[PDB]
Design a protein around this ligand. Structure first.
Ligand code: FSC
Ligand code: FSC
Lengths: 234, 52, 237, 50
């Protein structure tokens, strides 16, 4: 049997891991794929797998964090100081993991993924990633640590948008996905809902004006969903 | 109750189910909301937007 | 000023809701090591079982997904992928081993011995068959024989005690009936023993609807319909 | 309106049956995952355990 190369076995194992809900392994596998490439470009499929792997791994911690915060809100209501401190002790351990994960991918993005990026596409992809993980930090960091994080997010999304907006069609899944997240950053991190509605609505409008499909249409549905949520809430 | 009408209601519910599936699969908010539904967590709705 | 036990139990409940089940296990294990002659309360009991159920459940899920893929691939002649998938099934099989064994030795050293009432004893006997059953699901040949033997021994014990000491409507009794019947179906491949066992446990529950209980009723009611679900599927061949 | 709410109620109840199976059983959980992900995979032989 001809031994599979490191690249091909670990791309396949990432795909098994994803189907199997073994997302920490999926990261392990995609990092092995990344090492077999040095600073050469990942394919579309390879980078999508890598993004999905970190998306899920951090997602799980984002979800845990949101749930625990709601339990803590209810308990701040019900005046249960003892429970509130336990939840707080615990939300912390969660925040350490989020930190650690974020630092991991951010380091890979700065050292390998972003300078590898040839086409605008790929450059938008990676700078979006870099925006997102700084945003995830911003979600829970306090005053100065938040500002640093918000600062790093803006500068990545602004750099992505300046490429996407001039190099990619309004209908491009990555332009679309960037506007989604950039708009969210404004709504949730900066708390500027007018700025958020403006950006989201513009990306949606430019895209609508231009009418492959499947991913674009999903992200456009999400833009619309967000816009309708943010308005009924004004 | 008319077939064509029932058939269309089925198609519309199926179209929306399919969007609901993509949200739950691909978004933090979809995922989080289903986890609270599944568990039936006695918590008040978490404020969330969709990100990808 | 809450105790270290009380604190860990609250901690377990947080972890369950956050879906952080490995930590849930950790917290529940730190509880069952600190206890002496006392057995665990009903709540603690449940927290523990759920934690291991979920930690292990994630892997059983993984195992079945992967197996399904192996069969789609094997019927395509992708030797190359069938290797990777087998390599991977094996890595999971390992995890199932180590988890099953952590809990199985706890059951044997602490939890089972300290079980004083029927309730308590059935609850752990059931758990003992359960994790032997998880081994049997993926083990092969010799090791599977042992697993299957161990399973039958532990369930059969639990059942005699349940039949004499627990109400037929009692969720612990019903739960056993459910898993034991699954055991015969899925591991022993005896659909008639599976159905006979299930239908019986179901019917005794119905014969005694007088004994559904203020808190008991929703749990016992769910399990009853799970047995009916299995039966319904097993009967239609 | 009349037949439609009776329609939704039946749906809601079946949802509730699905929800419990997904929460407390391996089968339910596996099935959700296969549906959610849209895995093109042969139906797995499963029974309910707790
Ligand atoms: C599961 C397998 C993997 C490899 C992960 O693929 C997931 C998905 O990968 C691609 O889709 C991307 C993509 C997603 C799509 C919106 C999913 O589309 C549908 C219809 O389900 C969600 C993913 O996270 C992913 C990979 C990420 C991004 C995101 C990246 O930020 C750095 C920005 C937008 C979006 C882009 C890259 C999408 O093109 C494909 O276009 C999708 O398939 C098609 C053609 O419909 C496939 O479902
Ligand atoms: C998951 C949430 C936590 C907090 C852990 O509670 C688990 C659950 O714990 C109790 O229910 C038990 C129980 C389960 C019930 C059948 C769930 O029923 C409903 C309607 O919620 C499933 C669980 O795995 C658990 C704890 C386990 C067993 C199992 C033990 O084997 C060793 C065999 C029978 C079953 C018994 C012990 C059930 O009584 C309770 O009575 C349930 O509350 C309700 C609705 O009645 C609660 O959701």
């Amino acid at each position: 049997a001809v031994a599979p190369t490191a690249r091909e076995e670990n791309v396949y194992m990432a795909k098994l891991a994803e189907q199997a809900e073994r997302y920490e392994e999926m990261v392990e596998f995609m990092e092995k794929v990344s090492n077999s490439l040095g600073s050469e470009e990942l394919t579309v499929e390879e980078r999508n797998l890598l993004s999905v792997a970190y998306k899920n791994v951090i997602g799980a911690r984002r979800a845990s964090w949101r749930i625990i915060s709601s339990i803590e809100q209810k308990e701040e209501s019900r005046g249960n100081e003892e429970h509130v401190n336990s939840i707080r002790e615990y939300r912390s351990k969660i925040e350490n993991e989020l930190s650690k994960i974020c630092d991991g991918i951010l380091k890979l993005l700065d050292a390998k993924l972003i300078p590898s990026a040839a086409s605008g596409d790929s450059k938008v992809f990676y700078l979006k990633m870099k925006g997102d993980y700084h945003r995830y930090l911003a979600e829970f960091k306090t005053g100065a640590e938040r500002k640093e994080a918000a600062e790093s997010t803006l500068t990545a999304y602004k750099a992505a948008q300046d490429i996407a907006t001039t190099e990619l069609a309004p209908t491009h899944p990555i332009r679309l996905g960037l506007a989604l997240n950039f708009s969210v950053f404004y709504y949730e991190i900066l708390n500027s809902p007018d700025r958020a509605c403006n950006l989201a609505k513009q990306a949606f409008d430019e895209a609508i004006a231009e009418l492959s499909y499947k991913d674009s249409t999903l992200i456009m549905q999400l833009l619309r969903d967000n816009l309708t949520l943010w308005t009924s809430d004004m | 109750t008319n077939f064509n009408e029932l058939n269309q209601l089925a198609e519309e519910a199926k179209r929306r189910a399919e969007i609901a599936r993509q949200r739950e699969l691909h978004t933090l908010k979809g995922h989080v909301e289903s986890v609270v539904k599944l568990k039936g967590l006695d918590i008040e709705t978490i404020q969330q937007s969709y990100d990808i």
